[PDB]
Amino acid sequence: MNTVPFTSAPIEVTIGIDQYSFNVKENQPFHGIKDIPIGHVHVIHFQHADNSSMRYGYWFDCRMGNFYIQYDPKDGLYKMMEERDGAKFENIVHNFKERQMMVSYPKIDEDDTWYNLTEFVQMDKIRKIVRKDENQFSYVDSSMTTVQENELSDPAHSLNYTVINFKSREAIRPGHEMEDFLDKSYYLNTVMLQGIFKNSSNYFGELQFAFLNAMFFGNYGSSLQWHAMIELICSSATVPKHMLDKLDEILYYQIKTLPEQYSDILLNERVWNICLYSSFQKNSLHNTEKIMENKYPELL
Amino acid sequence: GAMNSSNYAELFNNDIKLFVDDTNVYRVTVHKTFEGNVATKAINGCIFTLNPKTGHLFLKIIHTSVWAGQKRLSQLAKWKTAEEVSALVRSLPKEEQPKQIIVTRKAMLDPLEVHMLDFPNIAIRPTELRLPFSAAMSIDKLSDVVMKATEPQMVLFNIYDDWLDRISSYTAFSRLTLLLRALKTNEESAKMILLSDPTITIKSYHLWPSFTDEQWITIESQMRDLILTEYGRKYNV
Ligand SMILES: C[C@@H](N)Cc1c[nH]c2ccccc12
């Protein structure tokens, strides 16, 4: 179990650590988060009290280094940084634990929610989507746009999600126009899986990462990507049975975890009704369809 | 975007454009089987592809054999239409290719967009006009070539006969659409109007009678009367 020490908390901020969150008051004696589960990626994120505009945050894996949060009064944000002096960090953390200045990552033992939302998410793949090579952790915020969004304006600060476009030459084979547009198995299995992602774990990983960024940061282009990747599977007649079973689980936990009050913006009526009720896989997402209908019958 | 009464003169500018109507691509008669069930028998159809400026009609005849052994024929008809239109463009010299294709039903937008991804500089647009192009099979000579075809075939016509020698494109398009509207609302009366006078003939190389300007005004008025009236007998007014 590892630790993210904060130098201090100079501005009032709501802190999120994965799906948990707590309010820190301006200049309260908060010095970070402890007992963070090793073995998973994590995201620590921030909504200032004064400006609910711009949620931002840091994806990180405690196995990849010792990390702390230091408020930056010039750029006006809580910034994730690395301490390469391992012993100096250990001493800093030991001192703040001895004085009990840290909140404890409050994982319930029955609770596999975070594992279930991050099963295929790995830092190495995050770092490919979010390009800032000098840091082992990855910054994301609400306003970041996606590579595809920039094709429809700063390339350094973008989300390099895989571009999916159902009306594109890559998606449509010459001479199979109708066949490939109404059944996207070619585009899913040959183009995307075999060609781009290599396997379905990489694909699911991007899908989960897109969902989490949409949910935690209200990142619109991440939300588009999540829906696009679901639709590409649901509109393929030919999908490995193990992918369909796993997709049903993935989506089930995403839908379970969504904030009930944010469902109207995070969930796309068209995509979901299509996927659950019209698409080739309309009968293949039993857990997802059951929770959707019981929790958000309104959308459908 | 879409096409309506506000950008109506655009049809007659100097950007090449075609309308594409697919409403006569898949045609069936519906009939009773020996078992008392119902079945459809397909008949020949056509894609109605029209340059509204020149009057040039690329009439792709859709022979019934194209449906043999195929399922979901209404959906395939839309994709067949888009394949034929795509092939048509590819066969034209670049300087003849349309800058826009306007489809008369929104369900052609995705099939055509997909078949034309090769042509990013060709805009595929719907329209809000209720164009009567479906009545094109009420034109005897068009109907005749469709029903006689024994194989796929493309036949070229000028749907305006020689009118562009005497009138503008706008006016000729307005005459065509009034004639087609009339034929669609009441084909018999529309056709009685056009031929009530045995001394007015259809030249072999034309589709419509050889009316003088003054005769065309009478005809156009009569067609308006028909459309007004049938709309009377329809809404009892
Ligand atoms: C002024 C900062 N460099 C203080 C600092 C260095 N390494 C750390 C690790 C954890 C918490 C604070 C620190």
Domain ranges of chain B: 9-163, 164-237
Q: What angle do CA B95, B100, B105 make, to 5 degrees?
A: 145
Burial state string for A196-227 with b = 16 or more CB within 10 A and e = fewer than 16: ebeebebbbbbbbbbbbbbbbbbbbbbbbbbb
Going by C-beta distance under 8 Å and a sequence separation of 6 or more, which residues neighbour residue B198?
none
Cβ distance of A177 and B114 shorter than 8 Å: yes
Question: How many angstroms separate the CA atoms of A157 and A37, rounded?
Answer: 29
> How far away, in angstroms, is A104 Cα from ligand 1 center?
20
Distance CA B30, CA A102 (A): 78
Tell the residue nearest (CA) to atom 6 of ligand 1: A83
**CB burial class (10 A; 0-12, 13-18, 19+) of residue A108?**
exposed
Whether B114 sits inside 8 A of A169 (CB atoms) is no
Half-sphere exposure of A263 (CA within 13 A, CB side): 18
- CB neighbour burial string for B224-237, b if at least 16 within 10 angstroms, e if fewer: eebbeebeeeeeee
Name the residue among B63, B62, B67, B106 with its Cα closest to residue B85.
Answer: B62
CB A67 within 8 A of CB A142: no
- Measuring CA to CA, which residue among A5, A101, A97, A87 is closest to residue A44? A5
Which residue is closest to B115 within chain A, CA to CA?
A177
DSSP 8-state symbol, A143: T
- Compute how many other C-beta atoms are within 10 angstroms of the C-beta atom of residue A47: 20
CB A222, CB A146: distance < 8 Å: yes
SS3 per residue for A99-130: CCCCEECCCCCCCCHHHHHHCCCCHHHHHHHE
d(CA B165, CA B182): 24
Residue in chain B closest to A168 (alpha carbons) equals B117
Q: Which of B76, B83, B113 sits opposite A167 (nearest CB)?
A: B113
Which residues, at least 6 apart from A28, have a Cβ–Cβ distance to it below 8 Å? A9
CA-based nearest distance B109→chain A, Å: 11
The residue length of chain A stands at: 300
At B183, list the tokens: 């034929």
Which of A263, A248, A275, A297 is CA-nearest to residue A116?
Answer: A248
- CA of residue B158 relative to chain centroid, distance: 12
Q: How many CB pairs under 8 A join A and B?
A: 23
What is the rounded distance in angstroms from the CA atom of residue B147 to the CA atom of residue A122?
64
Considering only CB atoms, which chain B residues are within 8 Å of A168? 117
Taking each helix axis from N to C terminus, what angle separates A269-277 and A220-234, rounded to the nearest 10 degrees? 20
CA A96 to ligand 1 centroid distance, Å: 12
C-alpha to C-alpha distances, B52 to A270, A300, B198, nearest whole angstrom: 36, 43, 30
- Partnered with residue B159 across adjacent β-strands are none
Quote the CA–CA distance of A265 and A288 in Å, as a whole number: 18
CA of A45 to the centre of ligand 1 (A): 19
In the block, which residue shows the tokens 């009609």? Answer: B57
Task: Confirm or reject: Cβ of A92 under 6 Å from ligand 1.
Answer: yes
Ligand 1 geometric centre to CA of A93 (Å): 10
Find all residues with CB under 8 Å of B188, minimum gap 6, and list them.
Answer: none
C-beta separation of B100 from B123 below 8 A: yes
Tokens of A197: 């992602």
Tokens describing residue A201: 């774990």
Q: Whose CA is nearest to atom 4 of ligand 1?
A: A7
Judged by CB atoms closer than 8 Å, whether chains meet at B76 and A178 is answered as yes
* Tokens linked to B9: 């003169």
Q: Which residues contact B122 (CB under 8 A, 6 or more apart)?
A: B89, B97, B98, B99, B100, B101, B116
Q: The domain B164-237 is classified under which CATH number: 1.10.150.120, 1.10.3720.10, 2.40.110.10, 1.20.80.40? A: 1.20.80.40
Distance A6 CA to ligand 1 centre (A): 8
Strands A42-48 and A56-60: antiparallel
Q: How was this structure determined?
A: X-ray
Check if the beta carbon of residue B208 is closer than 8 Å to that of residue B161.
yes
> Cβ atoms within 10 A of the Cβ of B117, count?
16
Whole-angstrom distance, CA of residue A213 vs CA of residue A202 = 17
Task: Determine whether the shortest distance from the Cβ of A83 to ligand 1 is under 6 A.
Answer: yes
Query: Ligand 1: does its nearest atom lie under 6 Å from the Cβ of A7?
Result: yes
How many angstroms does the Cα of residue A82 sit away from the middle of ligand 1?
8
Asked if residues A189 and A236 have their Cβ atoms less than 8 Å apart, the reply is: yes
Give the residue before each break in chain A, using a C-to-N cut-off of over 2.5 angstroms; say none if it is continuous: 152
Q: For chain B, what's the residue count?
A: 237
A300 contacts A255 by C-beta, under 8 angstroms: no
* DSSP structure class, residue A6: B
Orientation of helix A241-257 relative to helix A220-234, angle to 10°: 150
Token pair in block for residue B8: 């109506």
Domain that holds residue A193: 116-299
Check CB contact under 8 Å for A172 and B76.
no
Query: How is chain B classified by DSSP, letter by letter?
Result: ----GGG-GGGGSSS-EEEEE-TTTSEEEEEE-TTS-EEEEEE-EEEEEE-TTT-EEEEEEE-GGGGTT-S-HHHHHHHHHHHHHHHHHHHS-GGGS-SEEEESSGGGHHHHHHHTTT-TTSEEE---S---GGGGGGSHHHHHHHHH-SS-EEEEEETTTTGGGTS-HHHHHHHHHHHHHHHHH-HHHHHHHHHSSTT----TT-SS----HHHHHHHHHHHHHHHHHHHHHHH--
Q: Does domain B9-163 have CATH number 3.30.420.230?
A: yes
Beta bridge partner(s), residue A44: A17, A58
User: What CATH number should be reported for the domain holding residue A126?
Assistant: 1.25.40.550
Which positions ≥6 away from A90 have C-beta within 8 Å?
A: none
First-last CA distance in chain A: 42
Token readout for B194 is 């056009």
- Cα→Cα distances A279→A38, A285, B167, Å: 39, 11, 52
Q: What residue of A is the nearest CA neighbor of B113?
A: A167
- Whether residue A31 contacts residue A67, with contact meaning beta carbons closer than 8 Å, is answered with no
Beta carbons within 10 angstroms of residue B65's beta carbon: 12
Q: Is A257 helix (H, G, I), strand (E, B) or coil?
A: helix
Closest ligand 1 atom to the C-alpha of A89? 9
Which residues are bridge partners to A14 per DSSP? A23, A47
* Sheet with A42-48, edge to edge strand ranges: A20-24, A13-17, A42-48, A56-60, A138-141
Q: How many Å lie between the alpha carbon of B162 and the closest alpha carbon of chain A?
A: 39
CB-nearest to A181 from B83, B114, B118 is B114
The secondary structure of A70-99 as a DSSP string is EEETTTTEEEEEEE--HHHHHHHHHHHHHT
**Is residue A185 helix, strand or coil?**
helix
Does A169 contact B110 at a Cβ distance shorter than 8 Å?
A: no
> What is the greatest pairwise CA distance in chain A?
70
Which residues is A58 bridged to in the sheet?
Answer: A44, A139
Alpha helices in chain A (DSSP H): 86-98, 113-118, 123-129, 177-182, 185, 200-217, 220-234, 241-257, 263-266, 269-277, 286-295
From chain B, which residues contact A within 8 Å (Cβ)?
Answer: 75-76, 79, 82-83, 110-111, 113-115, 117-118
Rounded CA separation B200/A46 (Å): 84
- For residue A70, list its beta bridge partners: A79
